[PDB]
Design a protein around this ligand. Structure first.
Ligand SMILES: [Ca+2]
Length: 391
């Protein structure tokens, strides 16, 4: 037993522990002149003498279906607008003198391609454009700028709002894994961490240093566990999915990549017992579909449609599943990409996963922005591409 959580794995004749190194490199290219909205990322204030109307333009890119791009206006009880995304479509929320309205049009925006977005306040209406084409026009009577002393002021936040989401016209989860560039108001501060991947692909990226967890119920067979994971690994060892029983320091169920049977494998387990193993080309840079389904008297593991062989007898399989039932009988936590500090004998693998991954549990796609907790370095709705060879 080595410490996977520590970046070590058993090597060769099981005489020593070795470092878990990446077998597939992912591009690290960052876009210097860009802003990552993940993790308000920026608050601006425009003290303007002489009446004036709001005008703003910027480039935007994302695969994320929901979130807030920006806010503009004054006090939560005054007049303001919020540009957001819901179900992948642009949404404009407005509040003029306390009165709130909300509209959204057919422009699907979360396609991952850069696009120019513009917002302009005309004495008559508010106009929103996508690539020069007007997509929203709402009649309004009021002003976004507000008189203070002898000047006109206006606050603008990027990537979030100055108040709580519960005070919006329509509630929304603000977290937005998206990128901005070429800002033109009427913020270039070099901090690598604030820059976005130069190129993006679909999925969630796990650098291999943390996890995310949820509180999901698997009761009602009287119970059921179904998982579908689309993965593009960077390393041959790591936890993909797992359940944790806190008061027992146990890991009732886990699905992970393991390089020893020495073979590149995916393992399905209940606590320390491997129920099934299935081969997989974990280092060829390709995407693979791993699926698992368990119910009373049944457990199945598949990799790209092919079922793996059972590692236990029919009798002991029923014994293991019986114990699983007892566990699911009490509240457990669901982990993605890693585990908390648990006994090394608790499960076959405890190392953190490294690579791109999408998870669907009990037929429901998991959105990392909805997790009770998500380690800050995990990108919820984007993954860098595998790095191309020189040629
Ligand atoms: Ca989101």
């Amino acid at each position: 037993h080595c410490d996977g959580r520590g970046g070590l794995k058993l090597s060769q004749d099981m005489d020593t522990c070795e470092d878990i190194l990446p077998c597939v490199p992912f591009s690290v290219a960052k876009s210097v002149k860009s802003l990552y909205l993940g993790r308000p990322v920026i608050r601006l204030r425009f003290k303007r003498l002489q009446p004036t109307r709001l005008v703003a333009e910027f480039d935007f890119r994302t695969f994320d279906p929901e979130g807030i791009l920006l806010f503009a206006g004054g006090h939560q009880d005054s007049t303001w607008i919020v540009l957001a995304l819901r179900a992948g479509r642009l949404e404009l929320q407005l509040r003029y003198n306390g009165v709130g309205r909300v509209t959204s049009s057919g422009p699907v925006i979360n396609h991952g391609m850069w696009q120019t977005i513009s917002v302009e306040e005309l004495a008559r209406n508010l106009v929103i454009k996508v690539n020069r084409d007007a997509v929203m026009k709402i009649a309004v009577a009021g002003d976004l700028f507000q008189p203070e002393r002898g000047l006109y002021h206006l606050n603008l936040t990027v990537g979030g709002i100055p108040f709580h989401e519960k005070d919006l016209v329509q509630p929304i989860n603000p977290r937005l894994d998206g990128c901005m560039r070429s800002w033109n108001w009427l913020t270039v501060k070099v901090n690598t961490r604030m820059q976005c991947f130069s190129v993006t692909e679909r999925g969630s990226f796990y650098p291999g240093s943390g996890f995310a967890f949820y509180s999901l119920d698997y009761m009602r067979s009287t119970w059921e566990v179904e998982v579908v994971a689309h993965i593009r690994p960077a390393a041959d060892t790591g936890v993909l999915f797992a359940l944790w029983a806190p008061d027992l320091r146990a890991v009732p169920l886990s699905v992970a990549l393991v390089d020893y049977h020495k073979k590149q494998l995916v393992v399905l387990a209940v606590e320390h017992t491997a129920l099934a193993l299935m081969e997989i080309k974990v280092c060829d840079g390709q995407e693979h579909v791993v699926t698992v389904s368990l119910r009373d008297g049944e457990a199945t593991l598949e990799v790209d449609g092919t079922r793996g062989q059972s590692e236990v007898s029919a009798a002991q399989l029923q014994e293991r599943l019986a114990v699983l039932e007892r566990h699911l009988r009490s509240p457990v936590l669901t982990f993605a990409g890693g585990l908390p500090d648990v006994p090394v004998t608790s499960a076959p693998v405890t190392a953190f996963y490294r690579g791109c991954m999408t998870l669907e549990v009990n037929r429901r796609l998991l959105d990392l922005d909805e997790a009770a907790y998500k380690h800050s370095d995990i990108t919820a709705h984007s993954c860098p591409p595998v790095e191309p060879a020189a040629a």
